[PDB]
Amino acid sequence: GFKQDIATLRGDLRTYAQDIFLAFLNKYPDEKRNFKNYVGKSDQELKSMAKFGDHTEKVFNLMMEVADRATDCVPLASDASTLVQMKQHSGLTTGNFEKLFVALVEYMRASGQSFDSQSWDRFGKNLVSALSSAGMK
């Protein structure tokens, strides 16, 4: 289920974080507008950068927290406000988050593993709704 998937991802978080974020960047190349220093790089080049590993893992450290605090794939309102108010998210719209969650769900569906893809899809939609409610355009 969803809870086991959190334990699975946390068990190899630096590789799942990198693979899912690369799935997102390759699926939605225009999302590089928010990640200038990742332009014109192969996946292997990105995975060699200190910063890439360290920023993507920290992102997923918080994503797993938010997942873990959710009830029935409904995230806390306090976690959504933090994500809207964060200065690093100043320009973003819910569309940025929707795309990340589509890529994560498709990564899960294509994996060999018994991830609860439908729970991550609901989680993504509930998080987008909570970001909207907390004031993200």
Ligand code: HEM
């Ligand atoms: C649930 C989803 C997300 C979580 C939990 C999250 C979390 C975080 C965290 C913890 C940081 C700080 C990273 C660090 O200090 O190294 C960060 C930075 C950032 N996030 Fe997010 N984020 C999420 C979704 C997104 C999305 C969808 C975008 C853009 C499409 C985005 C864009 C950024 C940018 C541009 C930064 C700053 C880049 C930098 O570190 O210099 N985030 N995010």
Ligand SMILES: Oc1ccccc1-c1ccccc1O
């Ligand atoms: O790669 C990054 C570097 C810096 C800050 C955030 C990310 C990131 C990684 C995966 C998903 C969303 C993100 O904002």
